[model samples]
Target chain A: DIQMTQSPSSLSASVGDRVTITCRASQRIRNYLNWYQQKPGRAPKLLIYTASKLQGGVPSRFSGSGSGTDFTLTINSLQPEDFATYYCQQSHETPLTFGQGTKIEVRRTVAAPSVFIFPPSDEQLKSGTASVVCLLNNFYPREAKVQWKVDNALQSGNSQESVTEQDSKDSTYSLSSTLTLSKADYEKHKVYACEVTHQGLSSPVTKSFNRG
Target chain B: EVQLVESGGGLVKPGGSLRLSCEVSGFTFSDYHATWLRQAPGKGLEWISYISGSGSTTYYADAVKGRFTISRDNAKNSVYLEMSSLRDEDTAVYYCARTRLGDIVQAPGVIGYYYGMDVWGQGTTVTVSSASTKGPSVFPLAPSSKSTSGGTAALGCLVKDYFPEPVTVSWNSGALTSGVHTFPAVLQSSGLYSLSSVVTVPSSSLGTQTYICNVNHKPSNTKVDKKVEPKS
Candidate 1:
């Protein structure tokens, strides 16, 4: 019986960038592991099989790692046209099994969000009003979400950030979301977490702060 | 410059027998190894069996061990695969690859050889889809948890009573972990197969963690998971 797994369900990278994806077998697949590339509307072509061995006529930039259950496929330098979904399959056993594909898309040349957090001001604390600002600066694609949690309790501050600001120079955007609380609530020393979701991240990026 | 071409690829009914041929050219028929490989639609490749050029040595994947035969027609420069009791899921494109053999030891049977199928033929398609799809008999064996000192334990997972031998067994967790391994599938009188996979784990890992065994019946595209527990 065989099972296979692949990581980074999807990724974004630029031409000339190096990217790696991992595939693991449920058993020792040995050099039986093979990698394939499939573009939309096209049949998948074998690139590397028997783990690290490159198939004939394939480019030198495509490389593979072999051993035990864990195998990796590395694209040393991505060409713009080389983008596609990659899959790993094992032939060490009958009823060969394949890893769910990892999609590699061209990363448009855009800067990622330079994220920042603004703590409650001393004046706001004295005034018995408290709000922490989360800023997402200069990120592209214009779509992002932010979640606020206090002591793990969900805060409904428009998780999708209603007030999204666009940077005029490029289509990129800066997002700002604020969570306000009573001074007494902030004095409780509870944990406040701001989690940001973006397509650029393998997972959501999170920042945690203790409300004072 | 050696090349291979696959033949006799087409549709077959369930419970039918299939005979596909691989014709070799540009080389002596009995000088190198000829091998059979297959892939399901939208799937990866599988190594079925391989035979030396002299037709003296051959090896089959565990699942297809008894149900398929590997033979050669030396004079015709062709290799053949005869698979019986086919199932609906046997629909695939089968290819033949030429194996590049490395060092050979003559102590007895061929052993410890490093080689690969370097050249391949274009594929021939076959389809079989008139029978019911059945899954495997999957269950975890009594584990070897008796060692209190905690060294090594072998946990067996049995997957049997299935058709079209080519299922995969995998362990979600094992130490220095061996993969879910299958003994040669035995064809029952009922024309089904019985296969078993055993995974060995250290007692320390067995005591602290839960091991998951996943069985994927490839042809049917169905899966079942069994959590292995230590015997009390």
Candidate 2:
């Protein structure tokens, strides 16, 4: 088996631009490489298999080239719907693995972020230290406000935060913040809330932490 | 690490011979073992046999005992699967995979020694339909729902006025392919047949991607092709 590595983490192109994404195998995999196209929320469609051969019914414009270590998937006349994520996988070896996907989108500026929060974990009852982690994942722009509250009161101390800028692969951000508290306060059963504010979200999203 | 590449995906008629190839690279060809696999369009995987680099072979299923032959070409580093006495059921995607000693067998056939599949090749689809016959009549109709929802996009193919009851209806949008035989053909009052197959796309948008409907009338020589455009 061989490992597949893809290039050009993300691409920006016009509707008719010829988009090319490359995948390099760790070893000479012959023609065992396969390419797939994935939309925001849909099953991945196989574009090319065995390096250069196109799958059945795939558009002629979506052609593949190269062989062995270096293979490429080229979209001849990029269309609107083709602006999605592309991934490469190798079927030559077992325990099949995939390359980090490359997203193809209309060349544009950053957009707002989509935020989510992870619920609470167990073992933080009384007289101990517990960590409250809030995850703001899959957002854009990389800028946001994360506020922590305990029983409607602001949390100022014992908090650590991290922000991952827009990913080169998909131009999305994934960040998380954690609020540490004593076991006594965590056992009080007071509702803990995580609030996220971003330009993409008109209203701040607040989620009350609950036992998982 | 080794790799496998499958070739030969096309149409064949009953009683015709079908040959598929799996090209190998990277590792030494004669040192390891490989197996031939087959899967009908919507069916489960079937093992035809296990072929060693040294030219020895063993059968997995009785259905393929005498009808299929497994061979190898050490010079070109390739494996071959040749099937004879083809039938409609033989239409499938033929693939090859490398195996090891005592992998694990989920199905039946050739003993317990070689049980796992390590590397595999992309399948070579073989259709056992007669070339002399005409396909079914296919017409694109308006999809039932919008493209923005979680529900199925009810695009349908009206296969009207055709002979042969068991016609094949398939849908294709770019590389996105689907199949359905849910609504059976109705015997029209005129002694002909009619069928409506639903192509449930996730959403309604084709975004300039053309959707094609292929209806194959296997018995007689008639095939109708239709396309549906993106909703404007």
Candidate 3:
């Protein structure tokens, strides 16, 4: 149930640049997190989850913290429509997990080669808690998915995600898959995700983002 | 994935109880399933049940069932549903869904899931008390507009004076908690009385705090209040 993966990066950075994203928690999730902001047609909004609780009208500069298994999704001041591509998820438990988005482009550097996501410092190895790494980004196919759970509880992890990265201009390539949950199986409010599938045939498009 | 936009109108009394919440994001917590329904101020729908990101639930009528309960946190797939005992017939318009809800016999397989709500929400109105409490419960002291910019409203309680043999005038959301009854639809007639309860929310700058309108029966066992604002 925890799934959110949105790969489509280029590393660039304009609008103000404060990017920095990372939502990993296949284990040790405490505060239960949140962070959302979908443009395109409206409605996704809510940036930063239980890790904070800012949905009153939002826009205080957008802040979020981390606790148990590693988490971060800063944005400080990055407009221009925020640039696009930027996702990380984990609700705490129950089949929820996400992460697979990069797209920032205004040009910064992640080695440049067009960026493509998968490097938020691997969320510091889920803080040596339990979820080692479950980076399932955009990988398409029945609507790309990413899932894991530890602290809060839920399963399906041992080591998932493969890896790709295309897009000479479009045939679409950027794929990635992950699953690791180490630290002795962990537990503490766990939950993770990376889902996008939108009407591709109904369902998909999630992004939990938790770890604490 | 997690799209629940609610922020608007509400006014209560009678046996009063109105609690609304649904702040979610992205979608996970086992993948999809969150529902809450009732639409009767404009017409259409009624199927309240299913909110188990593991908060544990099941209730699609039996008369609103134990009232209602749902609180999820799957890292913030955010889920919440609380329906006290309200009854103006129990106002209308309250929806929250991500997919899979229906089948508790508004008509279908029965008990819960898929024949009623496959995924839909754009509602948020709670205006029980159809209008009939004999007349003169005295409502609306301030706020006829402006709570967060969206046709702000506020009514229930305003009689100037009353107490004849044939009495009745109402607007509910009373009792406070666990014991709700918000009635508004009773007019007895003696001197003169009026009735009006309209709630259309989502603009009190993102509203919350459900209105307040109370007035009991017999000769006099009164309680009056109305002040919901968020307009700038």
Candidate 4:
């Protein structure tokens, strides 16, 4: 069976937006790639056969391209009804396989998160131990990651010390992570950092707290 | 205006060798690929081989990988199918078809090539039998007015008792556009073969004109013509 891999497992698009999904075959399959569209409760409909030939009755906006190992399915000026999962299938040989699928959903406004790291206070250090806090604020889509580092080394075994909260006012998400260590170790480390990664941000945001 | 005519099919004993030819015209032979397909007496169609016009690339079905050879001659605008160690199951009508590499323009600069068969030959029959070879005896049946509907008469010709097996049947109508069906040759209990061809013509011509059935027996290098006229 030929293995098929699809990119952008899910995407956000609005009406009239052009969407393109890509599928790669494990081996050369020539022009035997086919594309299909499936809605929530309906069966998949073949949009393209033999790679680029549009099936009869299919809208002109839906098209397929490519040959050999790579293929793309493009929807020009997408409609509201086109917001569904699309799949690619290879018919070149037996044991035909389908791609994992790409779902097109309604577009939403995205906001990049802000990262902040708070170092241990002197009062907390009096008890011989201290805790560092990393906070991410105002991120949309509710999915984000927070990593903690002390003196350039990643901290582990603190997954249970994280929490995510949603703002009822704007539906934005916030996450916080805490790392605890001995006061002596914190003083010697010199720096504590938090790296926040979210889809809204093109790259991860890192904020550091200096012991000085 | 493209045309394909297959020849060189005849009786072949089991374990013998055979060669078939497809002479094509009306197009440049070197610009496209040729494919060979076959069908047993009552079975489905099967692909035999595909050869590029230049004979540089070739693909064969798994069953005929080592036994069958497909080659072409661009100068003569012809393709050939050669096989050895023939078997009874190899008795079939072999057809040669032309393939075109079609292109799909997906976008301004993106295109895909799709290879497809576009034209096909009428097919030539190859028969494998252990019986001794013989020539066909042709007979034109009397034209029947009631044999067909839609104001047409069915004119038939029977070619029977030939050995190893195939014979070509045609009419003297200059050329036929449609309404012609040739049945596959069947081996008889005595190891001989038999088949028939039927042509439908306007019933008004049944009594006023005569029809001729031409049978070409390649193995015997003989041509037999039989004529029939409806009796008033």
Runs of candidate 1 exceeding 4 Å displacement: A1-4, A8-14, A25-57, A66-69, A80-212, B103-114, B131-232
TM-score per candidate, in order?
A: 0.45, 0.36, 0.23, 0.38
Could you tell me how far off, in angstroms, the CA of residue B109 lies in candidate 4 after the best superposition?
A: 21
Fraction of native Cα contacts reproduced by each candidate: 0.01, 0.00, 0.00, 0.01
| lDDT string, candidate 3, A1-212, tens digits | 43443333345455666766666665676766556554322233445555655545567766777756666767777866575554454544433344554555343222111111121122233445222322222222323444444443445535344333322222122323333344544434444544433223255443344443
Please write out the lDDT profile of model 2 over residues A125-199, one tens digit for every residue. Answer: 232655565656556655688999888889896666655423445556655566666676676756788888887
Least accurate stretch of 10 residues (summed lDDT) in model 1 chain B? Answer: B105-114
lDDT of 4 at B89: 84
> Across the candidates, what are chain A's individual TM-scores?
0.54, 0.56, 0.24, 0.55
| lDDT for each candidate structure | 0.67, 0.63, 0.44, 0.70
TM-score of 2: 0.36
For residue A53, what is the lDDT in candidate 4? 87
Q: For model 3, what is the error of residue A37's alpha carbon versus the real structure, in angstroms, after optimal superposition?
A: 5.5
What is model 2's C-alpha RMSD? Answer: 19.6
Q: Mind giving the per-residue lDDT tens digits that candidate 1 earns over A1-212? A: 78888998778777799999999899886677778786643445678867887777889999999788999999988986677889887755444456878878654555566454444555446757565656565577566778888788888733223232233344355565656677887777578777888877668887666644
DockQ (Cα-based) for each candidate: 0.02, 0.01, 0.01, 0.01
User: Which of the CAPRI classes, incorrect, acceptable, medium or high, describes model 2?
Assistant: incorrect
The per-prediction tally of clashing pairs is 5, 20, 113, 0
Candidate with maximal lDDT: 4
RMSD of each: 22.5, 19.6, 26.2, 33.4
Give the TM-score, chain B only, in order for the candidates: 0.52, 0.59, 0.25, 0.60
